Amino acid sequence: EVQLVESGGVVVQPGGSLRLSCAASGFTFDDYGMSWVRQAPGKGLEWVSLISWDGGSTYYADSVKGRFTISRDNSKNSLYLQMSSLRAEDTALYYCASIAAAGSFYYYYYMDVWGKGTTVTVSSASFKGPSVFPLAPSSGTAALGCLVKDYFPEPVTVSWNSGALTSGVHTFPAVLQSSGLYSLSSVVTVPSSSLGTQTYICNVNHKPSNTKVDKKVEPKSC
């Protein structure tokens, strides 16, 4: 199978440097130019760099020129992106893509093969496991949940009742707070009749801090 595989995306401090890799398999790598394209959280696709088949020509978007260097090693079927002077706005999913050439004299281009991406997080935050606070059901249909607050970096996972409760669950995208820490909510709607009887436990896992928490959520003790 034709494939591209990106790696190297990690947390990196502002002002820092990081090198991404893209491994090619299943095609003659040196017949193709290559591109890097990135996507900041919640934003559109942004092309950032390209390189010709032998590395003899390179080009950059104005957003990264002078800070990023694209290179390749055809003997290793590898494409690289060296980033430097990193900024918060470089935080993104980075994709590599092959440049197909066609038409007269092979001058015409499209990006046909894409990898799955690698994630770069530019931040000076250090690791922190979440605090898991109840969204208690109020005193038909009730809502309850867990507030998974103040963790770094992404991601967290949330299940309910060890995966036995899936209907009516909504786990929201995290938000990045101005502290540099993430917060996420997970909610479920259940029958009000069940609040006296049925146990509700959110199971939170934050692998980057080695933190597993089980949080039971009930009506408030008044």
Partner: protein, 212 residues
């Protein structure tokens, strides 16, 4: 300065969808179109204005020349919910357009609204988070206004929204208002007011600090 029109649209399964692009220069290399689904990598659908990539369904097509290009889905299918991007190669740069998000049109559903006070366990640590949930609504457009003793709060909340539900085609939204414990304890009435086209009047959920 590429453009795409509209920025978002809603259509029913079986509807014709038309999305337009304006290139930033008279095109001199290929104008291509990509599909990106939530949480997945972009996929090339159409290259060189109108050519279907091998294996792409017949319902996708494209046309245009000069600066003006159109991408069409003849009959929208559930699997076509995605963001679509045009792409040019001009001035030695690839540029992607701003994208057009397509979702499923369904009947209007007003949100069910819930407010959650900060927990006593959180307040012990010096911060208060107040959460407002807007559950299972359509269309996507909704406004949350936080008020504290009748003061409109701005700059001190964040929200996020789920992807469109695969079965009922609704959205849900969570907003969090954050303040210090000290500020929280200086005020009584915490209120979330929700505006949505399915509601006759905005719905307000509120609590008084300290009450059961």
């Amino acid at each position: 300065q590429m453009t795409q029109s509209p920025s978002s649209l809603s259509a029913s399964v079986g509807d014709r969808v038309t999305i337009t692009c304006q290139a930033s220069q008279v095109i001199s290399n290929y104008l291509n179109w990509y599909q990106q689904k939530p949480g997945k990598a972009p996929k090339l659908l159409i290259y060189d204005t109108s050519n279907l990539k091998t294996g792409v369904p017949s319902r996708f097509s494209g046309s245009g020349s000069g600066t003006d290009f159109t991408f069409t889905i003849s009959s929208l299918q559930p699997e076509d919910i995605a963001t679509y991007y045009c792409q040019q190669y001009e001035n030695l740069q690839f540029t992607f357009g701003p994208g057009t998000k397509v979702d499923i049109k369904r009947t209007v559903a007003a949100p069910s609204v819930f407010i959650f006070p900060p927990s006593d366990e959180q307040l012990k640590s010096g911060t208060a988070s107040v959460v407002c949930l807007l559950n299972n609504f359509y269309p996507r457009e909704a406004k949350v206004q936080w008020k504290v003793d009748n003061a409109l709060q701005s700059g001190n909340s964040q929200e996020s929204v789920t992807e469109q539900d695969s079965k009922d085609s609704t959205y849900s939204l969570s907003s969090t208002l954050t303040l210090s414990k000290a500020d929280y304890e200086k005020h009584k009435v915490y209120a979330c007011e929700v505006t949505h086209q399915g509601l006759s009047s905005p719905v307000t959920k509120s609590f008084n600090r300290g009450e059961c």
